[PDB]
RNA sequence: CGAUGUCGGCUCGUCGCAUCCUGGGGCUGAAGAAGGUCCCAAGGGUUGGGCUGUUCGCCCAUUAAAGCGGCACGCGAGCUG
RNA sequence: GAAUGCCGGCAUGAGUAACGAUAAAGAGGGUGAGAAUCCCUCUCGCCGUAAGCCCAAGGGUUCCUACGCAAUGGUCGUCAGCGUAGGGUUAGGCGGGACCUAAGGUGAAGCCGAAAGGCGUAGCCGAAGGGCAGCCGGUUAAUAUUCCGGCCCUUCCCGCAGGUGCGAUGGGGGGACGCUCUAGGCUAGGGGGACCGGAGCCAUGGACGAGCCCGGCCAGAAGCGCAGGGUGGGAGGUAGGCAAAUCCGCCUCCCAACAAGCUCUGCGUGGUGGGGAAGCCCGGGUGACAACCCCCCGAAGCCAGGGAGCCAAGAAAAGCCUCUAAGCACAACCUGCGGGAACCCGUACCGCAAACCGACACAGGUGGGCGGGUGCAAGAGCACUCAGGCGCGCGGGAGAACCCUCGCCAAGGAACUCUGCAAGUUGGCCCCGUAACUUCGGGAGAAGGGGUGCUCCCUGGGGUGAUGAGCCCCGGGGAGCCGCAGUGAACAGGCUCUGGCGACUGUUUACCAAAAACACAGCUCUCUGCGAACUCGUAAGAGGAGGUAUAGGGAGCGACGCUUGCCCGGUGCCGGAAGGUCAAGGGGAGGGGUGCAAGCCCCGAACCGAAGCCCCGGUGAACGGCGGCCGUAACUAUAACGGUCCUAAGGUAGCGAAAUUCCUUGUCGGGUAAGUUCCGACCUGCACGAAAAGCGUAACGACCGGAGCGCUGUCUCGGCGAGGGACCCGGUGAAAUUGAACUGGCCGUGAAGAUGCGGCCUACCCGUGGCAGGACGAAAAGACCCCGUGGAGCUUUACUGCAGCC
RNA sequence: GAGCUAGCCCUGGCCAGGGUGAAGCUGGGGUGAGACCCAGUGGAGGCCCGAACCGGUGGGGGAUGCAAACCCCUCGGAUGA
RNA sequence: UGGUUCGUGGAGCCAUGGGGGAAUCUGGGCGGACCACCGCCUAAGGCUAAGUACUCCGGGUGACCGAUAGCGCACCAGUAC
RNA sequence: GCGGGGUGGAGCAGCCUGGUAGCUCGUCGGGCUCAUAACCCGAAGGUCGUCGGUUCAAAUCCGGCCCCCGCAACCA
RNA sequence: CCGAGGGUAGGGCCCGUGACUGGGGCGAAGUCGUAACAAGGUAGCUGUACCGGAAGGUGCGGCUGGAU
RNA sequence: UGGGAGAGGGUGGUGGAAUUCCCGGAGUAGCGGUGAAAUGCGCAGAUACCGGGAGGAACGCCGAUGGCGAAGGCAGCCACCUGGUCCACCCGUGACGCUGAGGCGCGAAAGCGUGGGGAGCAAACCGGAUUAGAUACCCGGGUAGUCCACGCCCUAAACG
């Protein structure tokens, strides 16, 4: 059937994108948390 | 009149539509229309704040002149009478001798080609707007301001009207469409005559779709819901109310008066409404 | 109760006998024929339909007879639902 | 040594299931260590409104070539979307940006919030909407509207010339709009051609033919032509379009007006540039100096901002045109011409799939465009087939049971079963014909029947031509011919009668319920006078609504017809400047502590004192409720009638063994040979009843009963056949489960159902195909049940609080 | 976290072919004028049949699946909520 | 109302959202309701090292571990997935 | 299995709170009327379901038995 | 070709009959009330509407075939 | 041709008395109703009185045994539109007449549909009396309806 993952590059960057994270306290905390963990990528990769 | 159909489909059996006899122009004045922003009953939080709304026909908002005392003493010609989707009334296109074109809601019996005028010295004839004090007591009137210069707020719906009952100091006594008796300031403008298109209420939608065309989404009874949703929710099989009939939000909805008693306007309301 | 699937139907049998029919009998208020009643007998047999989910039961048309029970109310790693 | 323990390793099941659509293969020749599987050829089959092609998402080098086969590939592999290396994506015109706005987002000003933050007009951002300039062909192994060739065009900059009151983020016009139907003319596309060009072809009985097979175009500026969109001209006044205005708007006048003119597109032509098949010679050469014409069909596409009708009344902003303001009129803008300038990103490849979403090379899911021909009434349906693409990445055998999908069946014809479940039957089109009842629409495809092919003769009307031939579209009548059968194949209703429910089309439990449930137009109650009520929010602010009682919220009821009774004691709600109660506060008769005292301090009665409650009323389409015993009629039975107890009042009309009836398969009728169902009745209604509506109702229903007809493999009752499996061989090779096992029957025993204990009986060792009685077989720490001072959802006149409101 | 799903908002797109024949308009009859009747034209509709497309009614298969919802046959809607 | 051991308690102290609202030393606060006496202190402005907390980093040391341990990671790990 | 009830002839008080049986109808007797009904005036009639126990004393309180009507009977 | 007729299918009319139901007509002395006839003790009658055990009552209009 | 009387019809307007309600003022212990009463209303200030408003329906006196109309029926007053009818003059046309199965129209009250309106009245309904009963007559309330517009219904002691 139709499944849950319907990739959409714009939707990805707009929802989980770096600029989206930064615009919000919780999202900055995400970036902070992910940096502190030493995540190689802070934000999902998407080709714009 | 109101137009009936032959029962050539189940829905067409009872459906009635407006006769559109008074309509002389079938497109609006381009400079007097802005796009209407459909809400879907959602407020700026994106929350449904009025239920069961949306999906209706696209509409363009016709700017309506609810002041009229802008152009005092300047008469206008009733150039056309048109369809307005945003209200029950008809709207009359005015071509002022000024060159300015505006809309008013069209009063009953108002005729295309006639002249109308606004002001204290205006004649007492249909389509003219005057401050209430200069209008004879007992005269039928619509599009009445509630406060001076604040805009026509009263009796604007199709077939509605108010009647001037008398005078008291700086205020006049109106009988509003609701039957409520009220003190309205004398300096409030109003148009002599009743709102036209009285047959509006004789319209039988006929079928569900007609409701949807109007942006009125299906309304679901509380009785048909579950207790999480609504005080009338639950019960095995059908249930009677089982409590005082109530809203989804729990307040009582059969007789429970809800206007604020301490409202400053209570001093100006002579008699509560009718039936 | 870290599960022994629960009615009935179907299918498939198999067993018991308190025997429904067939076989052998005694007694009879057994003339004959047909019955009643008991005893011996489990070899085989024991129909098709209307109604109900029905087991059962009533009814129809027959029949030598249209038996009653057990097998986890036999049988859902066989099926039905 | 155990924790259904944790991590890992390795077993068992087992050479077992399976190897992923039943569209299908066979042979020859290559390559190579090795080939059913890679390459080539021929034959066969499949798709062809796709299973072909193009585009967008998404993917990200998967593209091309070379060299490879460890792993990946459900087998194999020499092949590959795999490994390694090299190469490949070219734009002013395509897309996106350097343009515009949409919802929304963000947000000068501003508002709000303990903080974080929430808002918010303008502005900005934001597209698959608007606006905007490239078409045809050639080329590469791989890119092409991008490179090249021809023919075109856009913007910016500067210069020249002519013109002009030039000048904007300002004003104005315009952009600018739905749905259904649709005219005229074109094209795209298609069919035919006795015409034109073309390698050849004469087979096997005939055919050298007016034969067969193949092809008969594409792009193109100005101009002209055809069709169409858009647009009135002039003057006078002007007070509106937040300044201005010669513009727009309004008034008046003349001129003219389904014309024309001017303008703008589509189409045809058009200098020019292309392209060009079958066949046989190895993607190429040839054909070829290819020809490149006529007729017909013809769009849903084009002219397109066309027209008509309708109600539900159908974006914005820029580009563009016009107007004026600062300014400026050496400027500046317009027009034409010339030269120069024109950036950033995408561009490979897959793209209904083996490269996207599904853990897989997964029978699933994925928007837009093109989608040829013939026939069947039409069509995107159906069968075949073109272009093109495929035979689905395990095979070879065999010809059991059994399973799946499939075909047929004598006689019967639902006897099967909970049920005609399933499968039959019916099946398109034309004609004839069609009942109750009805809301006059319908019920209708009711039912039921006839016709249907092919050949010859005669003929009627239309489209295109021209009024005619030819072509094409409907037809009508004659006479014939063949078959078992003519919508000869594929696709294409079984019908009827009668109840229950719901009016109806719709909606729902994604993934066990599609229903009688939800919605529904309609009805009635109730709230709400507008800074509405109500909703979200601490707030600001929003929705409501740029609405105004013919409007909005809430609730019930559920088209329609006829209706909707009595109870206001209780609860609810509504009304009630009395009275009773009532908190803070006001008051301070009067006490009290301390102080040598003034004083300080504490307590404190009467009275005044809000809502709320109490109290007086009203209120049912508000919550709800609508009796008991006993007796009486010139037969019995019954009780129109009476007596009496209680009630706030005692169930009205209608309907009733019901979707409700316990007794119950009530009784009686109907239908049947037989009817626990059904239909109709009756009424002592365990336990109907009037908007949680009552009783009806045409039409409708993949709803649920009952019946008949039709027809059948459902059945009596089974048989045979087909293919895909099951079986055999080669290849690859799982799984849950598993204390260990050397794992028989009976009668016992045993924690009460024993392969494992006793006694007896039986039994050589080991498998294969099958069956499912047992291993209280597997699976899931029973969802029922109880327990726990476990949890959660839900309720309320349980408790206690909180919002909200007073 | 609304790339699934539910609603709403904004902007686009899709719906072969056939059937039925409402209003209106015209003509005719009618009448004092009418209502009305007839015929033609017309092309309405949560109208009818039926693909795409959206569904998911009944049955079978599947059930360590092709698939953690699929396949076949069948069936609902298909200008509209 | 909050803080303190103080949960309304005889509830002072400190802090303050609301109402009322002084004085400048003969002023004012405090010593646990209050009053008297005896005393303590000087509100309504601000600053101030050190002694204290911590270990991302460097070093030293262990009756700490020794690759299922020790950090999640001894290894190209916040990686592959 | 649980509740309520049994009292002049009929229907209901009294029982709770022991001593005292009452209301309406009916029945009888007398009136009015030509007569009946209505109406008027009088009167009777229960020993309280039944047996036991408590009490000085039982319709009353308690227990058992007959009765008479209601209500229940769920999880499978 | 026509064709008696047989068969299939659906209509129309008529008659008989049917659980039950609806009132009607008649039936020596049944139960309840007393609506009408005398102003019948509320003048009657009436068309219609609603209601009630029943006659009946009531509303709105009408009539006199009513007043004394 | 000239003239007359008339609640004939239709439309729009508009006037006063009264009833009810509401507000304001004054005022107190009852008012109301009946055969007599009760219910009901009233110290929460009713009745009775004066002033203010709102609203609906019906038109007193004239008014008669009267007039009009085909009937049903028609009554404050104004205006507009319109029918019928009588008279007079003796002008015109020359039997153009009478009746009328069907048709068609009109048709009191009640009733019905969709709206509006609703003061008074009042079926139904409730209550208080009466009564053996009283689903009646009398009393206190009260919903349809009475009223308007449009559409139906088409009956009558539609009678002279
Ligand atoms: K249970
Ligand atoms: Mg996933
Ligand atoms: Mg994207
Ligand atoms: Mg996108
Ligand atoms: Mg997106
Ligand atoms: Mg973002
Ligand atoms: Mg890194
Ligand atoms: Mg992130
Ligand atoms: Mg209609
Ligand atoms: Mg109109
Ligand atoms: Mg605009
Ligand atoms: Mg927002
Ligand atoms: Mg938001
Ligand atoms: Mg709401
Ligand atoms: Mg909404
Ligand atoms: Mg309008
Ligand atoms: Mg609408
Ligand atoms: Mg609803
Ligand atoms: Mg529910
Ligand atoms: Mg919720
Ligand atoms: Mg709730
Ligand atoms: Mg409820
Ligand atoms: Mg119920
Ligand atoms: Mg319920
Ligand atoms: Mg409630
Ligand atoms: Mg509220
Ligand atoms: Mg009011
Ligand atoms: Mg158990
Ligand atoms: Mg088990
Ligand atoms: Mg179980
Ligand atoms: Mg004998
Ligand atoms: Mg004998
Ligand atoms: Mg014997
Ligand atoms: Mg035997
Ligand atoms: Mg049986
Ligand atoms: Mg049994
Ligand atoms: Mg039985
Ligand atoms: Mg015998
Ligand atoms: Mg048993
Ligand atoms: Mg069993
Ligand atoms: Mg089973
Ligand atoms: Mg079973
Ligand atoms: Mg079941
Ligand atoms: Mg151990
Ligand atoms: Mg395990
Ligand atoms: Mg093995
Ligand atoms: Mg095995
Ligand atoms: Mg598989
Ligand atoms: Mg395969
Ligand atoms: Mg090959
Ligand atoms: Mg390999
Ligand atoms: Mg290698
Ligand atoms: Mg592999
Ligand atoms: Mg391999
Ligand atoms: Mg594989
Ligand atoms: Mg090799
Ligand atoms: Mg270029
Ligand atoms: Mg630049
Ligand atoms: Mg922008
Ligand atoms: Mg913001
Ligand atoms: Mg953005
Ligand atoms: Mg764009
Ligand atoms: Mg472009
Ligand atoms: Mg071009
Ligand atoms: Mg200019
Ligand atoms: Mg517009
Ligand atoms: Mg439309
Ligand atoms: Mg055309
Ligand atoms: Mg063709
Ligand atoms: Mg001007
Ligand atoms: Mg100006
Ligand atoms: Mg050549
Ligand atoms: Mg035109
Ligand atoms: Mg147009
Ligand atoms: Mg805008
Ligand atoms: Mg100069
Ligand atoms: Mg110019
Ligand atoms: Mg740049
Ligand atoms: Mg490219
Ligand atoms: Mg596609
Ligand atoms: Mg692929
Ligand atoms: Mg594969
Ligand atoms: Mg696939
Ligand atoms: Mg066809
Ligand atoms: Mg294959
Ligand atoms: Mg074999
Ligand atoms: Mg057969
Ligand atoms: Mg048969
Ligand atoms: Mg049957
Ligand atoms: Mg069977
Ligand atoms: Mg069934
Ligand atoms: Mg059946
Ligand atoms: Mg067929
Ligand atoms: Mg037929
Ligand atoms: Mg033939
Ligand atoms: Mg069909
Ligand atoms: Mg039934
Ligand atoms: Mg339903
Ligand atoms: Mg339905
Ligand atoms: Mg549902
Ligand atoms: Mg479901
Ligand atoms: Mg579910
Ligand atoms: Mg699920
Ligand atoms: Mg299912
Ligand atoms: Mg359905
Ligand atoms: Mg409905
Ligand atoms: Mg209704
Ligand atoms: Mg809220
Ligand atoms: Mg608004
Ligand atoms: Mg509903
Ligand atoms: Mg309902
Ligand atoms: Mg009917
Ligand atoms: Mg009550
Ligand atoms: Mg009350
Ligand atoms: Mg009450
Ligand atoms: Mg009711
Ligand atoms: Mg109650
Ligand atoms: Mg009653
Ligand atoms: Mg019954
Ligand atoms: Mg019942
Ligand atoms: Mg029963
Ligand atoms: Mg029976
Ligand atoms: Mg029986
Ligand atoms: Mg019987
Ligand atoms: Mg049944
Ligand atoms: Mg009975
Ligand atoms: Mg209810
Ligand atoms: Mg109810
Ligand atoms: Mg019914
Ligand atoms: Mg029906
Ligand atoms: Mg259905
Ligand atoms: Mg078979
Ligand atoms: Mg086979
Ligand atoms: Mg392998
Ligand atoms: Mg035992
Ligand atoms: Mg054992
Ligand atoms: Mg042993
Ligand atoms: Mg032993
Ligand atoms: Mg077994
Ligand atoms: Mg088993
Ligand atoms: Mg556990
Ligand atoms: Mg357990
Ligand atoms: Mg469990
Ligand atoms: Mg238990
Ligand atoms: Mg415990
Ligand atoms: Mg608990
Ligand atoms: Mg969504
Ligand atoms: Mg989405
Ligand atoms: Mg079509
Ligand atoms: Mg069509
Ligand atoms: Mg149509
Ligand atoms: Mg349809
Ligand atoms: Mg398509
Ligand atoms: Mg299915
Ligand atoms: Mg089926
Ligand atoms: Mg199955
Ligand atoms: Mg499954
Ligand atoms: Mg499928
Ligand atoms: Mg359809
Ligand atoms: Mg204490
Ligand atoms: Mg304290
Ligand atoms: Mg102290
Ligand atoms: Mg403070
Ligand atoms: Mg001091
Ligand atoms: Mg202090
Ligand atoms: Mg101190
Ligand atoms: Mg002290
Ligand atoms: Mg101190
Ligand atoms: Mg100080
Ligand atoms: Mg320090
Ligand atoms: Mg160690
Ligand atoms: Mg060591
Ligand atoms: Mg480690
Ligand atoms: Mg270790
Ligand atoms: Mg480390
Ligand atoms: Mg680790
Ligand atoms: Mg990672
Ligand atoms: Mg007592
Ligand atoms: Mg006593
Ligand atoms: Mg005598
Ligand atoms: Mg007497
Ligand atoms: Mg004693
Ligand atoms: Mg005693
Ligand atoms: Mg005693
Ligand atoms: Mg329970
Ligand atoms: Mg014959
Ligand atoms: Mg009488
Ligand atoms: Mg009488
Ligand atoms: Mg009398
Ligand atoms: Mg009388
Ligand atoms: Mg009389
Ligand atoms: Mg009675
Ligand atoms: Mg009455
Ligand atoms: Mg008389
Ligand atoms: Mg007083
Ligand atoms: Mg003469
Ligand atoms: Mg003469
Ligand atoms: Mg009337
Ligand atoms: Mg009438």
UniProtKB/Swiss-Prot annotation, chain A:
Residues covered by region (Disordered): 26-48
Biased composition (Basic residues): 29-48
GO biological process terms on file: translation
GO MF annotation list: structural constituent of ribosome
One GO CC annotation: ribonucleoprotein complex
Role summary: Found on the solvent side of the large subunit.
Miscellaneous comment as given in the Swiss-Prot or TrEMBL entry: The open reading frame (ORF) for this protein is entirely within the ORF for the RNase P protein (RnaP). The two start codons are separated by four nucleotides.
Subunit structure: Part of the 50S ribosomal subunit.
NCBIfam families, alphabetized: rpmH_bact
Protein's name according to its UniProt entry: Large ribosomal subunit protein bL34
Annotated organism of origin: Thermus thermophilus (strain ATCC 27634 / DSM 579 / HB8)
From Swiss-Prot, chain B:
A single GO cellular-component term on record: large ribosomal subunit
Ribonucleoprotein is among the record's keywords: yes
Residue ranges, annotated region (Disordered): 222-275
Biased composition (Basic and acidic residues): 229-239
Any Gene Ontology biological process: cytoplasmic translation
Cited SUPFAM superfamilies: Nucleic acid-binding proteins, Translation proteins SH3-like domain
Pfam families noted in UniProt: Ribosomal_L2, Ribosomal_L2_C
Record keyword Nucleotide-binding present: no
UniProt feature, compositional bias: Basic residues: 256-275
GO molecular function: rRNA binding; structural constituent of ribosome; transferase activity
SMART domains for the chain: Ribosomal_L2, Ribosomal_L2_C
Keywords attached to this entry: Ribonucleoprotein, Ribosomal protein, RNA-binding, rRNA-binding
UniProt record similarity statement: Belongs to the universal ribosomal protein uL2 family.
Assembly behavior: Part of the 50S ribosomal subunit. Forms a bridge to the 30S subunit in the 70S ribosome, contacting the 16S rRNA. May also make transient contacts with protein S6 during translation in the 70S ribosome.
PANTHER family, sorted: LARGE RIBOSOMAL SUBUNIT PROTEIN UL2M (PTHR13691:SF5), RIBOSOMAL PROTEIN L2 (PTHR13691)
Function (record text): One of the primary rRNA binding proteins. Required for association of the 30S and 50S subunits to form the 70S ribosome, for tRNA binding and peptide bond formation. It has been suggested to have peptidyltransferase activity; this is somewhat controversial. Makes several contacts with the 16S rRNA (forming bridge B7b) in the 70S ribosome.
Official protein name in the record: Large ribosomal subunit protein uL2
Organism (species): Thermus thermophilus (strain ATCC 27634 / DSM 579 / HB8)
